[PDB]
Amino acid sequence: VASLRQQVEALQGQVQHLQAAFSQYKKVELFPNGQSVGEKIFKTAGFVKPFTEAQLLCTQAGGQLASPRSAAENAALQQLVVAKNEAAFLSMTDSKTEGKFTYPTGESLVYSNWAPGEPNDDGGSEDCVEIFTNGKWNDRACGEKRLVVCEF
Amino acid sequence: SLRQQVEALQGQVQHLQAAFSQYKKVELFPNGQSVGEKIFKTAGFVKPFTEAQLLCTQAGGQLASPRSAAENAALQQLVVAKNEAAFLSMTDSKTEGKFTYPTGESLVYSNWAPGEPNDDGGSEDCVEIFTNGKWNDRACGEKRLVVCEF
Amino acid sequence: ASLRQQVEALQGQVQHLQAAFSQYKKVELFPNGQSVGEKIFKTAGFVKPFTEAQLLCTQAGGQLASPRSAAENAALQQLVVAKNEAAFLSMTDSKTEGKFTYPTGESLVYSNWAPGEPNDDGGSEDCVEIFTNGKWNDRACGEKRLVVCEF
Ligand SMILES: O=P([O-])([O-])O[C@@H]1[C@H](O)[C@H](O)[C@@H](O)[C@H](O)[C@H]1O
Ligand SMILES: O=P([O-])([O-])O[C@@H]1[C@H](O)[C@H](O)[C@@H](O)[C@H](O)[C@H]1O
Ligand SMILES: [Ca+2]
Ligand SMILES: [Ca+2]
Ligand SMILES: [Ca+2]
Ligand SMILES: [Ca+2]
Ligand SMILES: [Ca+2]
Ligand SMILES: [Ca+2]
Ligand SMILES: [Ca+2]
Ligand SMILES: [Ca+2]
Ligand SMILES: [Ca+2]
Ligand SMILES: [Ca+2]
């Protein structure tokens, strides 16, 4: 009760210090390759890789390829693409069933920002998705190299 | 009961303090410098002043603004490490011959190289810091290392 | 009463902090870091001679990569492979030729020498590099290798 009192007051000061310090470091971490939106964080590796390699990199790091689920998330992701001036791969593919794009979990899309006419499975071999500097999406061959951006 | 939960909380906080301390060192390696309560971090690339300024602002910070010999030395470490002169936040764009911080406040510290600022060519309103730590006013259109402070 | 509620509220903040921190740790490690046990390896992304690399890590509050187990070596190997550049380890045999030690002076507790190593080629190889295949080779300290520090 009494001793417990001080202990609680001491913890409050320690917690406040951690909160202030962490707040500062979050900003530091995101500069210049990250974007925070809601409770999601997008971070680019800064280089390009084919889809399979990009996917593995994100998976191994405990995240997954960028998967914008709203206009807000897509705009945040667009900021990184614009900054690096390099279109990036999204996590979604229609490799299982042509014409039906899904997230790595198999769930159907809850948001999309396809450029006019897309997806068009050009050449009959486009099962991956890239996001342009203007934020629009286009289905593209998974063998192509695009900016690696993961979400955590 | 409450005494058992408090010890559990104490343990969680001690763990966080240890984990956070380790994480701070990791984050700052190799592009950051901690001095006092300020943190300097370089983006690792060069940009013209206006662009560099926007990058820092959008990140929730601002261009490096050394306010003491100690901060200037910390900033100097990053410049030396990348071997690339960097832009500071200060400019005399509003009133030629009078440098101020983004807020409009006058300088509280300066480390100008001999003869500077000299508004060379009548068009130097930005400031760069060299690997030796000294400052020189330069054209804002030139590209220099982007270093922000948080 | 008020104390208990004050403690439960404090724990709510602490667990929220734990969650935020966990997310930011993963973000931090991507793509230049690797965590293994309580150790963290992080590459600077560039190459430097041994003395300079050692100074960079020391000044950052850590030390050059010092894998002490197969698990740590495999973790470090991931970074070397990602950068496709052999990296320097912290150990040297500068004090006593043929006897590699950590910066502390302690003898190795783990090694993963490539066949035929360490050979002290030219009679002047007192530093250690780790290849993309995870094997070690003694190399001249003047050579430039990927900088990887451990924290
Ligand atoms: O192959 P390319 O003609 O250079 O470029 C193609 C066009 O931009 C097309 O509109 C788009 O739908 C394809 O995905 C792209 O591959
Ligand atoms: O134009 P430059 O002669 O190559 O270099 C100039 C000189 O170093 C001058 O002393 C300095 O005050 C100017 O800011 C620089 O631009
Ligand atoms: Ca298909
Ligand atoms: Ca398709
Ligand atoms: Ca297409
Ligand atoms: Ca002027
Ligand atoms: Ca001027
Ligand atoms: Ca000048
Ligand atoms: Ca970081
Ligand atoms: Ca020797
Ligand atoms: Ca030797
Ligand atoms: Ca050898």
Short mmCIF file of C-alpha atoms and ligand atoms in Angstrom, two decimals:
data_model
loop_
_atom_site.label_atom_id
_atom_site.label_comp_id
_atom_site.label_asym_id
_atom_site.label_seq_id
_atom_site.Cartn_x
_atom_site.Cartn_y
_atom_site.Cartn_z
CA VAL A 1 0.00 0.00 0.00
CA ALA A 2 2.50 2.60 1.21
CA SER A 3 5.59 1.17 -0.47
CA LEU A 4 3.40 0.16 -3.40
CA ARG A 5 2.42 3.83 -3.61
CA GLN A 6 5.94 5.08 -4.36
CA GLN A 7 6.49 2.17 -6.74
CA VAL A 8 3.45 3.24 -8.75
CA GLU A 9 4.54 6.89 -8.79
CA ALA A 10 8.01 5.81 -9.92
CA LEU A 11 6.60 3.73 -12.77
CA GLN A 12 4.52 6.68 -13.97
CA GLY A 13 7.68 8.75 -14.42
CA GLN A 14 9.47 5.90 -16.18
CA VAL A 15 6.52 5.31 -18.49
CA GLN A 16 6.24 8.99 -19.36
CA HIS A 17 9.94 9.03 -20.26
CA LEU A 18 9.54 5.99 -22.53
CA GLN A 19 6.49 7.48 -24.23
CA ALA A 20 8.26 10.77 -24.98
CA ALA A 21 11.44 9.04 -26.15
CA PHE A 22 9.53 6.56 -28.29
CA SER A 23 7.47 9.33 -29.86
CA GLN A 24 10.67 11.01 -31.02
CA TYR A 25 12.22 7.81 -32.36
CA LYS A 26 9.13 6.92 -34.40
CA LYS A 27 9.65 10.06 -36.46
CA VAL A 28 13.35 9.33 -36.76
CA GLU A 29 12.72 5.77 -37.95
CA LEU A 30 10.30 6.74 -40.71
CA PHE A 31 12.74 9.25 -42.20
CA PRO A 32 13.21 8.95 -45.14
CA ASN A 33 11.95 5.53 -46.25
CA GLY A 34 8.77 5.03 -44.25
CA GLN A 35 5.17 6.22 -44.13
CA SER A 36 2.75 5.86 -41.25
CA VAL A 37 -0.99 5.78 -41.93
CA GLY A 38 -3.44 4.77 -39.23
CA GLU A 39 -1.88 1.80 -37.47
CA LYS A 40 -0.06 0.61 -40.61
CA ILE A 41 3.53 1.40 -41.60
CA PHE A 42 4.88 1.17 -45.15
CA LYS A 43 8.65 1.01 -45.58
CA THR A 44 10.70 0.73 -48.73
CA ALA A 45 13.93 -1.22 -48.99
CA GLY A 46 15.06 1.33 -51.55
CA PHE A 47 15.78 -1.17 -54.33
CA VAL A 48 13.94 -3.21 -56.97
CA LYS A 49 13.38 -6.98 -57.14
CA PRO A 50 11.15 -9.44 -59.05
CA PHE A 51 7.87 -10.27 -57.29
CA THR A 52 8.86 -13.61 -55.73
CA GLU A 53 12.06 -12.18 -54.26
CA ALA A 54 10.28 -9.04 -53.04
CA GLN A 55 7.56 -11.15 -51.43
CA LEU A 56 10.09 -13.33 -49.60
CA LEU A 57 12.02 -10.30 -48.32
CA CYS A 58 8.89 -8.86 -46.70
CA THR A 59 7.69 -12.21 -45.36
CA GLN A 60 11.04 -12.99 -43.73
CA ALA A 61 11.06 -9.54 -42.14
CA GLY A 62 7.76 -10.26 -40.41
CA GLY A 63 5.55 -8.25 -42.74
CA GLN A 64 4.20 -8.54 -46.26
CA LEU A 65 4.25 -6.59 -49.51
CA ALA A 66 2.34 -3.31 -49.50
CA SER A 67 -1.40 -3.99 -49.45
CA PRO A 68 -3.34 -0.70 -49.38
CA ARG A 69 -6.89 -1.31 -48.12
CA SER A 70 -8.20 2.25 -48.49
CA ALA A 71 -7.64 5.48 -50.41
CA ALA A 72 -5.74 6.85 -47.41
CA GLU A 73 -3.33 3.91 -47.30
CA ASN A 74 -2.88 4.05 -51.06
CA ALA A 75 -2.02 7.76 -50.95
CA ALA A 76 0.51 7.14 -48.19
CA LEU A 77 2.13 4.39 -50.25
CA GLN A 78 2.10 6.69 -53.26
CA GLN A 79 4.21 9.17 -51.28
CA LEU A 80 7.05 6.62 -51.04
CA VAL A 81 6.77 5.63 -54.70
CA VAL A 82 6.94 9.29 -55.72
CA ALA A 83 9.90 9.94 -53.42
CA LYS A 84 11.90 7.09 -54.94
CA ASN A 85 10.47 7.71 -58.41
CA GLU A 86 10.04 3.95 -58.89
CA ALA A 87 6.79 2.02 -59.35
CA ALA A 88 6.35 -0.66 -56.67
CA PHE A 89 4.84 -4.13 -56.34
CA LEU A 90 1.72 -4.69 -54.26
CA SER A 91 1.03 -8.01 -52.52
CA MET A 92 -1.99 -9.03 -54.58
CA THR A 93 -2.08 -11.51 -57.46
CA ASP A 94 -4.60 -13.40 -59.59
CA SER A 95 -2.26 -16.36 -60.05
CA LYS A 96 -4.73 -18.83 -58.54
CA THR A 97 -7.77 -17.72 -60.54
CA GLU A 98 -7.23 -15.42 -63.53
CA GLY A 99 -9.19 -12.20 -63.18
CA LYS A 100 -9.62 -12.57 -59.42
CA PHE A 101 -7.04 -10.67 -57.40
CA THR A 102 -6.53 -11.59 -53.75
CA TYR A 103 -4.23 -10.82 -50.84
CA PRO A 104 -1.62 -13.40 -49.73
CA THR A 105 -4.30 -14.75 -47.38
CA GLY A 106 -6.66 -15.55 -50.25
CA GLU A 107 -9.11 -12.82 -49.28
CA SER A 108 -10.67 -10.80 -52.13
CA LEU A 109 -9.76 -7.12 -52.50
CA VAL A 110 -11.57 -4.59 -50.31
CA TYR A 111 -10.04 -1.66 -52.22
CA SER A 112 -8.50 -1.03 -55.64
CA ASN A 113 -7.28 1.93 -57.68
CA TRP A 114 -6.88 0.48 -61.18
CA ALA A 115 -5.82 2.78 -63.99
CA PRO A 116 -8.47 2.89 -66.76
CA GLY A 117 -8.75 -0.44 -68.57
CA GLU A 118 -6.70 -2.36 -66.00
CA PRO A 119 -6.26 -5.10 -65.12
CA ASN A 120 -5.90 -6.31 -68.71
CA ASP A 121 -3.65 -9.38 -68.32
CA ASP A 122 -1.60 -8.02 -71.21
CA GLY A 123 0.02 -10.75 -73.28
CA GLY A 124 -1.95 -13.16 -71.13
CA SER A 125 0.77 -13.14 -68.50
CA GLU A 126 0.20 -10.40 -65.92
CA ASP A 127 -0.69 -11.74 -62.49
CA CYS A 128 1.06 -9.21 -60.27
CA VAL A 129 0.21 -5.57 -59.50
CA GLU A 130 2.32 -2.42 -59.62
CA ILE A 131 1.47 1.03 -58.27
CA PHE A 132 2.59 4.08 -60.30
CA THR A 133 3.87 7.46 -59.11
CA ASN A 134 0.36 8.78 -59.75
CA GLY A 135 -0.99 6.16 -57.36
CA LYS A 136 -2.87 4.16 -59.99
CA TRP A 137 -2.55 0.39 -60.32
CA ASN A 138 -1.67 -1.82 -63.27
CA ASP A 139 -1.36 -5.58 -63.47
CA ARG A 140 2.14 -6.53 -64.60
CA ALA A 141 4.27 -9.61 -65.21
CA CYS A 142 5.61 -10.93 -61.91
CA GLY A 143 9.03 -11.41 -63.51
CA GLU A 144 9.54 -7.64 -63.77
CA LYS A 145 11.59 -5.75 -61.18
CA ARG A 146 9.80 -3.15 -59.07
CA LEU A 147 10.42 -1.15 -55.90
CA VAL A 148 10.21 -3.29 -52.77
CA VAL A 149 7.83 -1.84 -50.20
CA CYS A 150 6.65 -3.81 -47.18
CA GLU A 151 3.92 -3.13 -44.65
CA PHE A 152 4.13 -3.78 -40.92
CA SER B 1 -2.64 -9.50 -5.71
CA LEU B 2 -2.03 -5.83 -6.52
CA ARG B 3 1.50 -6.30 -5.19
CA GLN B 4 2.02 -9.16 -7.65
CA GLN B 5 0.67 -7.19 -10.61
CA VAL B 6 2.84 -4.19 -9.73
CA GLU B 7 5.97 -6.34 -9.79
CA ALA B 8 4.81 -7.68 -13.14
CA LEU B 9 4.49 -4.10 -14.40
CA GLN B 10 7.90 -3.18 -13.00
CA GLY B 11 9.32 -6.10 -14.94
CA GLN B 12 7.65 -4.99 -18.17
CA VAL B 13 8.97 -1.45 -17.82
CA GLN B 14 12.51 -2.62 -17.06
CA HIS B 15 12.37 -4.85 -20.15
CA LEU B 16 11.17 -1.94 -22.27
CA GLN B 17 13.93 0.30 -20.94
CA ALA B 18 16.53 -2.31 -21.90
CA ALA B 19 14.96 -3.04 -25.29
CA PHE B 20 14.51 0.63 -26.15
CA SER B 21 18.10 1.47 -25.27
CA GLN B 22 19.32 -1.24 -27.62
CA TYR B 23 16.91 -0.11 -30.35
CA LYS B 24 18.09 3.50 -30.10
CA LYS B 25 21.68 2.50 -30.83
CA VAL B 26 20.54 0.40 -33.75
CA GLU B 27 18.40 3.17 -35.24
CA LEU B 28 21.18 5.77 -35.11
CA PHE B 29 23.65 3.45 -36.83
CA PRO B 30 24.99 4.69 -39.22
CA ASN B 31 23.03 7.80 -40.25
CA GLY B 32 22.12 9.44 -36.96
CA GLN B 33 23.69 11.40 -34.13
CA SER B 34 22.23 12.08 -30.70
CA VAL B 35 23.19 15.26 -28.86
CA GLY B 36 21.30 16.38 -25.79
CA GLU B 37 17.62 15.93 -26.57
CA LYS B 38 18.16 16.53 -30.29
CA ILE B 39 18.69 13.93 -33.00
CA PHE B 40 20.32 14.62 -36.38
CA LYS B 41 19.64 12.09 -39.12
CA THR B 42 20.79 12.18 -42.72
CA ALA B 43 18.69 10.86 -45.58
CA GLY B 44 21.90 9.77 -47.26
CA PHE B 45 21.34 11.74 -50.46
CA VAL B 46 21.53 15.30 -51.79
CA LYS B 47 18.74 17.69 -52.78
CA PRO B 48 18.31 21.41 -53.51
CA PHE B 49 17.31 23.51 -50.49
CA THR B 50 13.56 23.77 -51.12
CA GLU B 51 13.22 20.01 -51.61
CA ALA B 52 15.45 19.16 -48.64
CA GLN B 53 13.39 21.55 -46.50
CA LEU B 54 10.09 19.96 -47.54
CA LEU B 55 11.41 16.46 -46.83
CA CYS B 56 12.29 17.35 -43.25
CA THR B 57 9.05 19.24 -42.64
CA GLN B 58 6.89 16.40 -43.96
CA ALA B 59 8.81 14.01 -41.71
CA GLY B 60 7.80 16.03 -38.67
CA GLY B 61 11.15 17.73 -38.21
CA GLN B 62 13.21 20.41 -39.94
CA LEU B 63 16.60 20.94 -41.54
CA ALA B 64 19.60 20.64 -39.21
CA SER B 65 19.78 23.71 -36.98
CA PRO B 66 22.90 23.57 -34.76
CA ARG B 67 22.46 25.97 -31.82
CA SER B 68 25.74 25.33 -30.01
CA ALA B 69 29.29 24.11 -30.52
CA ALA B 70 28.15 20.73 -29.19
CA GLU B 71 25.32 20.35 -31.70
CA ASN B 72 27.53 21.59 -34.53
CA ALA B 73 30.15 18.95 -33.70
CA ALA B 74 27.52 16.19 -33.70
CA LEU B 75 26.21 17.36 -37.06
CA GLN B 76 29.77 17.56 -38.35
CA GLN B 77 30.21 13.83 -37.65
CA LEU B 78 27.49 12.95 -40.17
CA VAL B 79 28.90 15.31 -42.80
CA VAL B 80 32.36 13.78 -42.35
CA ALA B 81 30.92 10.26 -42.40
CA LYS B 82 29.18 10.88 -45.73
CA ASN B 83 31.95 13.19 -46.94
CA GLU B 84 29.28 15.55 -48.26
CA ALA B 85 28.54 19.13 -47.18
CA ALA B 86 25.00 19.56 -45.84
CA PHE B 87 22.33 22.25 -45.81
CA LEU B 88 21.33 23.95 -42.56
CA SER B 89 17.82 25.34 -42.01
CA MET B 90 18.83 29.00 -41.83
CA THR B 91 18.55 31.55 -44.65
CA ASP B 92 18.67 35.31 -45.25
CA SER B 93 16.00 35.14 -47.96
CA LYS B 94 13.73 37.63 -46.20
CA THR B 95 16.37 40.24 -45.37
CA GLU B 96 19.71 40.01 -47.18
CA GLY B 97 22.59 39.95 -44.71
CA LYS B 98 20.48 38.66 -41.83
CA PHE B 99 20.21 34.90 -41.35
CA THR B 100 17.33 33.43 -39.38
CA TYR B 101 15.82 30.09 -38.42
CA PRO B 102 12.63 28.90 -40.19
CA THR B 103 10.63 30.59 -37.42
CA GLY B 104 12.18 33.95 -38.27
CA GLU B 105 14.26 34.07 -35.09
CA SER B 106 17.80 35.45 -35.30
CA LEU B 107 20.77 33.09 -34.89
CA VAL B 108 21.85 32.22 -31.34
CA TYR B 109 25.02 30.52 -32.60
CA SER B 110 27.12 30.57 -35.79
CA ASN B 111 30.31 28.94 -37.06
CA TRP B 112 31.04 30.86 -40.26
CA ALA B 113 34.22 30.12 -42.18
CA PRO B 114 36.56 33.11 -42.69
CA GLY B 115 34.94 35.81 -44.81
CA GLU B 116 31.49 34.23 -44.76
CA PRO B 117 28.68 34.91 -45.28
CA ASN B 118 29.58 36.77 -48.48
CA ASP B 119 26.50 36.45 -50.73
CA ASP B 120 28.83 35.45 -53.57
CA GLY B 121 27.51 36.46 -56.98
CA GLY B 122 24.74 38.23 -55.10
CA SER B 123 22.75 35.01 -54.83
CA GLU B 124 23.65 32.99 -51.72
CA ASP B 125 20.81 32.86 -49.21
CA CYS B 126 21.23 29.31 -47.91
CA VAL B 127 23.87 27.81 -45.61
CA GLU B 128 26.04 24.71 -45.91
CA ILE B 129 28.26 23.08 -43.30
CA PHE B 130 31.61 21.62 -44.43
CA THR B 131 33.43 18.51 -43.20
CA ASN B 132 35.51 20.85 -41.02
CA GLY B 133 32.33 22.06 -39.34
CA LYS B 134 32.53 25.62 -40.64
CA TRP B 135 29.62 27.32 -42.41
CA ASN B 136 29.37 29.01 -45.80
CA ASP B 137 26.41 30.69 -47.45
CA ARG B 138 25.54 29.03 -50.75
CA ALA B 139 22.97 29.28 -53.53
CA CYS B 140 19.78 27.48 -52.51
CA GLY B 141 19.63 25.84 -55.93
CA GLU B 142 22.75 23.75 -55.28
CA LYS B 143 22.28 20.16 -54.10
CA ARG B 144 23.62 19.27 -50.66
CA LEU B 145 23.32 16.46 -48.13
CA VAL B 146 19.88 16.34 -46.52
CA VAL B 147 20.10 16.21 -42.73
CA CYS B 148 17.03 16.64 -40.57
CA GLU B 149 16.70 17.17 -36.83
CA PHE B 150 14.09 15.65 -34.53
CA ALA C 1 -8.97 1.18 -4.98
CA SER C 2 -7.54 4.25 -6.72
CA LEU C 3 -4.11 2.60 -6.60
CA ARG C 4 -5.34 -0.56 -8.35
CA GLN C 5 -7.11 1.43 -11.07
CA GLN C 6 -4.02 3.61 -11.37
CA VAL C 7 -1.96 0.45 -11.85
CA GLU C 8 -4.37 -1.07 -14.37
CA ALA C 9 -4.37 2.17 -16.37
CA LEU C 10 -0.58 2.32 -16.26
CA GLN C 11 -0.39 -1.27 -17.51
CA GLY C 12 -2.72 -0.41 -20.37
CA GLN C 13 -0.28 2.27 -21.47
CA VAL C 14 2.64 -0.10 -21.02
CA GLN C 15 1.06 -2.85 -23.09
CA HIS C 16 0.15 -0.31 -25.78
CA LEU C 17 3.79 0.80 -25.70
CA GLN C 18 4.92 -2.84 -25.94
CA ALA C 19 2.77 -3.26 -29.05
CA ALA C 20 4.02 -0.07 -30.71
CA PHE C 21 7.62 -0.96 -29.91
CA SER C 22 7.23 -4.46 -31.34
CA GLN C 23 5.97 -2.99 -34.61
CA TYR C 24 8.75 -0.43 -34.81
CA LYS C 25 11.42 -3.04 -34.09
CA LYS C 26 10.38 -5.03 -37.17
CA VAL C 27 10.29 -1.85 -39.21
CA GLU C 28 13.77 -0.87 -38.01
CA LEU C 29 15.33 -4.21 -38.95
CA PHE C 30 14.03 -4.03 -42.52
CA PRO C 31 16.10 -4.41 -44.65
CA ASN C 32 19.54 -4.03 -43.07
CA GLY C 33 19.20 -5.80 -39.74
CA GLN C 34 18.77 -9.27 -38.30
CA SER C 35 17.75 -10.24 -34.78
CA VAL C 36 18.84 -13.54 -33.22
CA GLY C 37 18.33 -14.19 -29.54
CA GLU C 38 18.99 -10.94 -27.69
CA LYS C 39 21.54 -9.88 -30.30
CA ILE C 40 21.01 -7.59 -33.29
CA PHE C 41 23.26 -7.41 -36.36
CA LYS C 42 23.01 -4.35 -38.57
CA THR C 43 24.96 -3.50 -41.69
CA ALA C 44 25.96 0.06 -42.59
CA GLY C 45 25.57 -0.88 -46.23
CA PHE C 46 29.11 0.04 -47.29
CA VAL C 47 32.67 -1.32 -47.07
CA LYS C 48 35.61 -0.04 -45.00
CA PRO C 49 39.05 -1.30 -43.91
CA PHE C 50 39.08 -3.10 -40.54
CA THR C 51 40.28 -0.31 -38.26
CA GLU C 52 37.72 2.14 -39.65
CA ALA C 53 34.93 -0.44 -39.51
CA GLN C 54 35.85 -1.26 -35.90
CA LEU C 55 35.78 2.42 -34.99
CA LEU C 56 32.35 2.95 -36.58
CA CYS C 57 30.84 0.14 -34.51
CA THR C 58 32.54 1.20 -31.28
CA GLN C 59 31.45 4.82 -31.69
CA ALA C 60 27.90 3.60 -32.35
CA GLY C 61 27.94 1.83 -28.99
CA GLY C 62 28.34 -1.69 -30.35
CA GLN C 63 31.12 -3.80 -31.87
CA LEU C 64 31.86 -5.62 -35.10
CA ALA C 65 29.81 -8.75 -35.79
CA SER C 66 30.88 -11.53 -33.42
CA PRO C 67 28.87 -14.69 -34.15
CA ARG C 68 29.16 -17.02 -31.15
CA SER C 69 26.97 -19.85 -32.46
CA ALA C 70 25.70 -21.49 -35.65
CA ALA C 71 22.42 -19.59 -35.23
CA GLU C 72 24.17 -16.22 -34.96
CA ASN C 73 26.40 -17.07 -37.91
CA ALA C 74 23.38 -17.97 -40.04
CA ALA C 75 21.71 -14.68 -39.10
CA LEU C 76 24.80 -12.67 -40.05
CA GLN C 77 25.03 -14.68 -43.26
CA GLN C 78 21.58 -13.39 -44.27
CA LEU C 79 22.90 -9.81 -44.35
CA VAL C 80 26.07 -10.69 -46.24
CA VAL C 81 23.98 -12.53 -48.84
CA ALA C 82 21.50 -9.66 -49.06
CA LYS C 83 24.32 -7.20 -49.74
CA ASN C 84 26.33 -9.78 -51.69
CA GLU C 85 29.48 -8.54 -49.93
CA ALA C 86 31.77 -10.42 -47.53
CA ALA C 87 31.91 -8.76 -44.11
CA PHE C 88 34.50 -8.32 -41.36
CA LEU C 89 34.05 -10.02 -37.99
CA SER C 90 35.43 -8.49 -34.77
CA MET C 91 38.01 -11.17 -34.04
CA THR C 92 41.75 -10.91 -34.74
CA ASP C 93 44.99 -12.74 -33.95
CA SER C 94 47.13 -9.61 -33.83
CA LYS C 95 48.36 -10.21 -30.27
CA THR C 96 49.26 -13.87 -30.73
CA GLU C 97 49.50 -15.18 -34.29
CA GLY C 98 47.24 -18.18 -34.79
CA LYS C 99 45.08 -17.39 -31.76
CA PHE C 100 41.95 -15.45 -32.67
CA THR C 101 40.18 -13.53 -29.92
CA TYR C 102 37.22 -11.20 -29.46
CA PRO C 103 37.89 -7.50 -28.69
CA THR C 104 37.87 -8.48 -25.01
CA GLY C 105 40.77 -10.89 -25.40
CA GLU C 106 38.64 -14.00 -24.88
CA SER C 107 39.39 -16.95 -27.17
CA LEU C 108 36.76 -18.04 -29.70
CA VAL C 109 33.86 -20.18 -28.48
CA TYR C 110 32.68 -20.82 -32.04
CA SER C 111 34.30 -20.83 -35.49
CA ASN C 112 33.23 -21.63 -39.05
CA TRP C 113 36.52 -21.61 -40.95
CA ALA C 114 36.43 -22.51 -44.63
CA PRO C 115 38.55 -25.56 -45.55
CA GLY C 116 42.23 -24.64 -45.24
CA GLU C 117 41.66 -21.55 -43.09
CA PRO C 118 42.91 -19.68 -41.22
CA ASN C 119 46.17 -19.79 -43.21
CA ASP C 120 47.73 -16.38 -42.47
CA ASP C 121 48.42 -15.86 -46.17
CA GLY C 122 51.50 -13.80 -46.91
CA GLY C 123 52.19 -14.01 -43.20
CA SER C 124 49.89 -11.02 -42.72
CA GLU C 125 46.22 -11.97 -42.29
CA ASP C 126 45.07 -11.05 -38.80
CA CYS C 127 41.42 -10.17 -39.47
CA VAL C 128 38.42 -12.36 -40.37
CA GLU C 129 35.84 -12.10 -43.14
CA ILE C 130 32.63 -14.10 -43.53
CA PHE C 131 31.59 -15.12 -47.07
CA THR C 132 28.11 -15.33 -48.60
CA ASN C 133 28.19 -19.08 -47.87
CA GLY C 134 28.74 -18.33 -44.18
CA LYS C 135 32.29 -19.69 -44.03
CA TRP C 136 35.16 -17.72 -42.53
CA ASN C 137 38.56 -16.79 -43.93
CA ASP C 138 41.40 -14.82 -42.39
CA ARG C 139 42.19 -11.72 -44.43
CA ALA C 140 44.48 -8.69 -44.32
CA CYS C 141 42.99 -5.97 -42.12
CA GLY C 142 43.77 -3.37 -44.78
CA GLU C 143 41.24 -4.90 -47.18
CA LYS C 144 37.80 -3.26 -47.39
CA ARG C 145 34.79 -5.36 -46.37
CA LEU C 146 31.11 -4.88 -45.52
CA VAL C 147 30.61 -3.18 -42.16
CA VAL C 148 28.24 -5.07 -39.88
CA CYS C 149 27.92 -4.19 -36.21
CA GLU C 150 26.22 -6.09 -33.41
CA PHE C 151 24.19 -4.51 -30.62
O1 LIG D 1 4.71 -3.67 -72.48
P1 LIG D 1 4.48 -2.15 -72.66
O2 LIG D 1 3.66 -1.92 -73.90
O3 LIG D 1 5.81 -1.47 -72.73
O4 LIG D 1 3.57 -1.60 -71.46
C1 LIG D 1 2.20 -2.12 -71.18
C2 LIG D 1 1.15 -0.91 -71.26
O5 LIG D 1 1.47 0.15 -70.32
C3 LIG D 1 -0.28 -1.49 -70.93
O6 LIG D 1 -1.23 -0.44 -70.98
C4 LIG D 1 -0.32 -2.16 -69.55
O7 LIG D 1 -1.63 -2.69 -69.30
C5 LIG D 1 0.72 -3.31 -69.47
O8 LIG D 1 0.65 -3.90 -68.16
C6 LIG D 1 2.15 -2.78 -69.74
O9 LIG D 1 3.10 -3.88 -69.66
O1 LIG D 2 31.85 29.32 -56.96
P1 LIG D 2 33.22 28.86 -56.43
O2 LIG D 2 34.24 29.94 -56.69
O3 LIG D 2 33.59 27.58 -57.11
O4 LIG D 2 33.16 28.72 -54.85
C1 LIG D 2 32.82 29.86 -53.95
C2 LIG D 2 34.04 30.15 -52.96
O5 LIG D 2 34.40 28.98 -52.17
C3 LIG D 2 33.63 31.33 -52.01
O6 LIG D 2 34.70 31.59 -51.11
C4 LIG D 2 32.36 31.01 -51.22
O7 LIG D 2 32.02 32.11 -50.38
C5 LIG D 2 31.18 30.71 -52.19
O8 LIG D 2 30.01 30.41 -51.41
C6 LIG D 2 31.52 29.52 -53.12
O9 LIG D 2 30.40 29.26 -54.02
CA CA D 3 -2.79 -15.77 -65.03
CA CA D 4 -3.81 -12.03 -64.67
CA CA D 5 -1.71 -4.38 -67.36
CA CA D 6 19.39 37.48 -51.11
CA CA D 7 22.42 36.30 -48.95
CA CA D 8 29.59 32.09 -49.54
CA CA D 9 15.79 2.85 -38.63
CA CA D 10 50.05 -11.78 -37.53
CA CA D 11 47.17 -14.16 -38.57
CA CA D 12 43.18 -16.76 -45.52
#
